[PDB]
Amino acid sequence: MKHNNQLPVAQLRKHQQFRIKTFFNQAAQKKARLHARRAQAAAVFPRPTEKLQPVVRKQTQRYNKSTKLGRGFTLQELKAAGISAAFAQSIGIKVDHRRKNRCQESLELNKKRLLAYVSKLVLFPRHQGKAKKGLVNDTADTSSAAQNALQTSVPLPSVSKREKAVSNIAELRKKKVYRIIRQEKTNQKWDGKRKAKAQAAAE
Amino acid sequence: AKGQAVGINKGFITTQLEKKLQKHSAVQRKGKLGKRVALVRQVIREVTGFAPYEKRIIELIKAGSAKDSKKATKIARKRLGTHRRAKVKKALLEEAVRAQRK
Amino acid sequence: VSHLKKTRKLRGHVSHGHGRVGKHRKGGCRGGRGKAGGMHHHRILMEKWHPGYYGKLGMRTFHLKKNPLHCPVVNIDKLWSLVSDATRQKYAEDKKKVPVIDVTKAGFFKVLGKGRLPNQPVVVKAKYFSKTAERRIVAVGGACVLTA
RNA sequence: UUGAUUUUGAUUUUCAGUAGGAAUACAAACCGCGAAAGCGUGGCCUAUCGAUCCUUUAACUUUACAAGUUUUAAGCUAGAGG
RNA sequence: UGAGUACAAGGUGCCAAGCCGCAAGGUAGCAGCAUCACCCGACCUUGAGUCUCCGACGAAGGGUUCGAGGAAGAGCUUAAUU
RNA sequence: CUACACCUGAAACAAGCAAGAUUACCCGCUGAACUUAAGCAUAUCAGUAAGCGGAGGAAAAGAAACUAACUAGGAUAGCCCCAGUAAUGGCGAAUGAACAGGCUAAAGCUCAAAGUGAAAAUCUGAAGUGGUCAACACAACAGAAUUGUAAUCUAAAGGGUCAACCUGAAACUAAGCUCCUCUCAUAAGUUCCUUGGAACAGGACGUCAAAGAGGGUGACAACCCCGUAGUCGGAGAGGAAGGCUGGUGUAAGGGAGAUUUCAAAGAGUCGGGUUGUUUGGGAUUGCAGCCCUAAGUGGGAGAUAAACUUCUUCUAAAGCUAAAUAUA
Numbered sequence: 032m033k034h035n036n037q038l039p040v041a042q043l044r045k046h047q048q049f050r051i052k053t054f055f056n057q058a059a060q061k062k063a064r065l066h067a068r069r070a071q072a073a074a075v076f077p078r079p080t081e082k083l084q085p086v087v088r089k090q091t092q093r094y095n096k097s098t099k100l101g102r103g104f105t106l107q108e109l110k111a112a113g114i115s116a117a118f119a120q121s122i123g124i125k126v127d128h129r130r131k132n133r134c135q136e137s138l139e140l141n142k143k144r145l146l147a148y149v150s151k152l153v154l155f156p157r158h159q160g161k162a163k164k165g166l167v168n169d170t171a172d173t174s175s176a177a178q179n180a181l182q183t184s185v186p187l188p189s190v191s192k193r194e195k196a197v198s199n200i201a202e203l204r205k206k207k208v209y210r211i212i213r214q215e216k217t218n219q220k221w222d223g224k225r226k227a228k229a230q231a232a233a234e
Numbered sequence: 235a236k237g238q239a240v241g242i243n244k245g246f247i248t249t250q251l252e253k254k255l256q257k258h259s260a261v262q263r264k265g266k267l268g269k270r271v272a273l274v275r276q277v278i279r280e281v282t283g284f285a286p287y288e289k290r291i292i293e294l295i296k297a298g299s300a301k302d303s304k305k306a307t308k309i310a311r312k313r314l315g316t317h318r319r320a321k322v323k324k325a326l327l328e329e330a331v332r333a334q335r336k
Numbered sequence: 337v338s339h340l341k342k343t344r345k346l347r348g349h350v351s352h353g354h355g356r357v358g359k360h361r362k363g364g365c366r367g368g369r370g371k372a373g374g375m376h377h378h379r380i381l382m383e384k385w386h387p388g389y390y391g392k393l394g395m396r397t398f399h400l401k402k403n404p405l406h407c408p409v410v411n412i413d414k415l416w417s418l419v420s421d422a423t424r425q426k427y428a429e430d431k432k433k434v435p436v437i438d439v440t441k442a443g444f445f446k447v448l449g450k451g452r453l454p455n456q457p458v459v460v461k462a463k464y465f466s467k468t469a470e471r472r473i474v475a476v477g478g479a480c481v482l483t484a
Numbered sequence: 485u486u487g488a489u490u491u492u493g494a495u496u497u498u499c500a501g502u503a504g505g506a507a508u509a510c511a512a513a514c515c516g517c518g519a520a521a522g523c524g525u526g527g528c529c530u531a532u533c534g535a536u537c538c539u540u541u542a543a544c545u546u547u548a549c550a551a552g553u554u555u556u557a558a559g560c561u562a563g564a565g566g
Numbered sequence: 567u568g569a570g571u572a573c574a575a576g577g578u579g580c581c582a583a584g585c586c587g588c589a590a591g592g593u594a595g596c597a598g599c600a601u602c603a604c605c606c607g608a609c610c611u612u613g614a615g616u617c618u619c620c621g622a623c624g625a626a627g628g629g630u631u632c633g634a635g636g637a638a639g640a641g642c643u644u645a646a647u648u
Numbered sequence: 649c650u651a652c653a654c655c656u657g658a659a660a661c662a663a664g665c666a667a668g669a670u671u672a673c674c675c676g677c678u679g680a681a682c683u684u685a686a687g688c689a690u691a692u693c694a695g696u697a698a699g700c701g702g703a704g705g706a707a708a709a710g711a712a713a714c715u716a717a718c719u720a721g722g723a724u725a726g727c728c729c730c731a732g733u734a735a736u737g738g739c740g741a742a743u744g745a746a747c748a749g750g751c752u753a754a755a756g757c758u759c760a761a762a763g764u765g766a767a768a769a770u771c772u773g774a775a776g777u778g779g780u781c782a783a784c785a786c787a788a789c790a791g792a793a794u795u796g797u798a799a800u801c802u803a804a805a806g807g808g809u810c811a812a813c814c815u816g817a818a819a820c821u822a823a824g825c826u827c828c829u830c831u832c833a834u835a836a837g838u839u840c841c842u843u844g845g846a847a848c849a850g851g852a853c854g855u856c857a858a859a860g861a862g863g864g865u866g867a868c869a870a871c872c873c874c875g876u877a878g879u880c881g882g883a884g885a886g887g888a889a890g891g892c893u894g895g896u897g898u899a900a901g902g903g904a905g906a907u908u909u910c911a912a913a914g915a916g917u918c919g920g921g922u923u924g925u926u927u928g929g930g931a932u933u934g935c936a937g938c939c940c941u942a943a944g945u946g947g948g949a950g951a952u953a954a955a956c957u958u959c960u961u962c963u964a965a966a967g968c969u970a971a972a973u974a975u976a
């Protein structure tokens with residue numbers, strides 16, 4: 032232990048010889064995954080690769096501003112779509128029963144998604160018989176033979192261009208932002224003692 | 235301030251949801267007493283009798299003074315842990331005492 | 337690598353530049369292994385190059401969650417640099433309506449004033465503002481808008 | 485009569501020009517003695533002394549991380565227990 | 567809490583180019599060093615007035631102090647040596 | 649008292665099951681010192697070696713008594729990050745996870761518990777009959793079982809009342825594909841000189857090439873022989889602990905939505921105390937003994953102990969489950 036350099040942080044203190052991980056399989060592994068995926072396509076041929084995924088906001092204050100692919104559709108949403116979980120599943124839709132909708136907009140996105148899905152759908156019944164729910168589409172669709180990816184057919188755009196208005200500037204200029212944030216933080220701070228005062232002056 | 239972060243009111247503005255639209259739950263129905271339950275429990279109660287500590291608490295309740303109430307609580311708290319479960323047991327015992335009067 | 341290393345040029349010099357008196361030995365010479373005796377014979381080291389190493393500071397956080405503490409900062413100077421040139425010029429000439437810059441979409445939350453602003457007017461949508469940020473924004477012919 | 489006091493920081497001695505011990509010169513105070521200038525940050529000067537963790541104390545719109553009120557528990561600055 | 571008069575991004579001593587001049591020297595002042603000033607925050611100190619008035623806001627005015635900081639960004643990735 | 653029934657235990661016999669082996673990876677236990685702290689007890693090495701008990705092709709884990717408090721997310725497992733961070737530690741040496749976010753992979757299901765009571769609707773064996781005869785379908789007779797088998801049900805519900813709209817064991821009957829194993833076959837110089845024991849060398853003339861990877865032939869040979877390439881090609885044989893897809897289609901079986909005096913869920917377990925042990929988990933990280941020992945809007949959880957008011961989230965104390973993962 033000699034010079035000005037930063038205090039070391041021990042690494043190999045235990046017996047690591049038993050505990051090392053090697054990455055050469057990676058090479059072949061990637062490849063394997065490829066073929067797997069491909070062999071899925073072939074065995075699934077008429078149907079799409081990835082099953083239908085709703086969308087939500089991310090779980091953290093910092094992530095809220097972004098968009099994320101959900102695991103499943105909210106029963107509430109399937110209702111507004113008019114699909115039973117079971118059916119949606121026979122369709123290739125992904126359902127999640129513990130998720131709940133606390134916003135109108137979160138219903139909207141997924142409705143739009145579901146509908147979009149259905150509209151673009153082709154359904155093969157036992158040969159030459161037709162059916163009703165989510166319905167069933169004409170025998171000629173058998174010839175249509177669509178191999179498609181879900182991002183192409185059922186996507187989600189957003190562009191950041193924020194529209195400008197002057198009248199509002201005239202408006203917004205009359206308040207004071209700092210003062211605001213301050214008095215607010217303040218209110219949250221002293222709320223408890225204040226309510227307690229109300230209760231105490233009331234009794 | 236609802237539209238703002240940091241107000242006593244949570245920042246963001248969301249379109250609220252209807253009573254009809256809200257999450258259907260079951261698991262939230264937990265502490266229900268089905269009459270079947272209730273009856274069965276009463277049956278077995280009579281079939282059973284009280285437990286010795288339950289008896290102690292009972293005497294204390296029948297008396298009714300401040301000291302007696304305290305002791306009822308203390309015992310419930312002490313045998314069961316959880317001041318709360320104590321409160322609950324006091325409730326149950328009182329119910330049986332009161333219903334026994336009639 | 338190997339042919340660059342000292343060893344090659346040390347071959348046959350017998351001490352390998354570790355000295356004839358003090359040669360290259362085990363932990364005893366290191367002064368004990370690792371951070372050993374920092375507080376004792378290594379006092380001078382610790383004190384001198386890592387002063388304040390031994391001791392305690394103020395307040396334990398049992399579980400610290402960083403996500404909610406997350407607050408990227410922006411400075412006034414980079415504002416116009418966020419939105420394109422098209423915008424600030426086109427509303428330098430056009431006074432009919434004024435530009436709205438959302439710091440949010442850029443991944444920032446609080447706006448601090450650092451430099452100074454063009455005399456051309458703006459609206460800035462941000463989570464928080466510093467006394468001076470608002471000062472300079474307003475004085476420029478601009479407006480502060482609170483987001484969530 | 486209590487200047488054996490309130491704030492900080494600096495300087496000199498030993499010196500890795502680290503710490504610690506001493507002492508000095510300032511700037512802000514609040515005082516005591518004297519008519520007053522003045523002199524008082526302890527003993528005429530050169531010795532008389534002690535870190536991390538822990539505890540205890542003084543003073544403070546520091547925290548307990550869904551929200552509160554308590555009780556309790558953590559802190560920041562500084563003494564004492566070595 | 568946040569690099570506080572929107573039109574700022576300084577002063578001084580050393581000092582390089584370019585331009586003058588045969589020369590003596592003159593002009594200019596990049597980088598660095600030293601120093602003084604301003605700034606954000608810690609710790610102190612001060613405050614008209616304002617409002618969602620009991621807690622926040624702020625015109626004016628400061629520090630013997632503290633900081634791995636501002637003041638026209640210097641980084642990030644790769645290889646090698648010690 | 650006898651016959652007889654039932655509960656309990658016993659012997660012989662019939663048909664089946666376990667006993668050891670395996671070591672890399674996996675599971676449940678048990679468990680140290682050398683070493684590092686320049687000494688040394690806490691600590692570290694480290695839940696590490698050795699020891700014991702269990703498996704499998706993987707094991708384990710898994711459908712929340714999870715996170716998070718946001719415009720929320722949502723089984724398990726691996727990768728990347730978060731991170732060397734929060735925390736733990738003679739706060740010394742040194743220990744040290746996870747949420748959010750980017751990916752790989754994707755999958756969800758079975759019980760207990762009011763409801764056959766218009767009737768045990770159930771399970772096992774079976775002389776036997778058909779069969780692809782070890783594997784399938786029926787089956788006279790026998791046992792199991794109301795101290796309860798099967799249908800509904802599993803909280804995402806559900807019962808009851810409507811109901812658009814759906815399904816198909818039986819039998820009959822056509823055509824096919826997948827995967828595995830063992831075999832059989834395929835270009836073009838052995839022309840000429842020189843040196844050699846040998847030409848596969850150096851020269852001269854030639855050829856094939858979706859074949860000039862590599863071998864063997866007396867020497868550094870595309871062309872002499874095996875091969876290589878066309879070949880996820882062609883031909884023959886046998887396979888599936890007895891692979892996979894049709895068409896009619898019976899008794900029978902579902903159910904979006906709608907409404908409704910309905911709506912029931914695991915106990916010496918959860919929780920507490922104490923003592924050990926373990927984790928970063930620090931006055932409630934996990935676990936184990938002993939002592940207490942529940943509840944029923946109850947019960948868990950919301951990274952500081954205890955009340956009290958309000959909000960949030962999940963349903964423990966029964967089970968199954970492919971994939972991505974690990975393999976000295």
Ligand SMILES: [Mg+2]
């Ligand atoms: Mg593998």
Ligand SMILES: [Mg+2]
Binds near residue numbers: 340341342
């Ligand atoms: Mg060199």
Ligand SMILES: [Mg+2]
Binds near residue numbers: 349
């Ligand atoms: Mg030499």
Ligand SMILES: [Mg+2]
Binds near residue numbers: 498
């Ligand atoms: Mg000395």
Ligand SMILES: [Mg+2]
């Ligand atoms: Mg004086």
Ligand SMILES: [Mg+2]
């Ligand atoms: Mg001391």
Ligand SMILES: [Mg+2]
């Ligand atoms: Mg300057």
Ligand SMILES: [Mg+2]
């Ligand atoms: Mg018997």
Ligand SMILES: [Mg+2]
């Ligand atoms: Mg065995």
Ligand SMILES: [Mg+2]
Binds near residue numbers: 683
């Ligand atoms: Mg060793």
Ligand SMILES: [Mg+2]
Binds near residue numbers: 686
């Ligand atoms: Mg040693």
Ligand SMILES: [Mg+2]
Binds near residue numbers: 694
């Ligand atoms: Mg450990």
Ligand SMILES: [Mg+2]
């Ligand atoms: Mg085996």
Ligand SMILES: [Mg+2]
Binds near residue numbers: 731
């Ligand atoms: Mg790392």
Ligand SMILES: [Mg+2]
């Ligand atoms: Mg993720």
Ligand SMILES: [Mg+2]
């Ligand atoms: Mg037979």
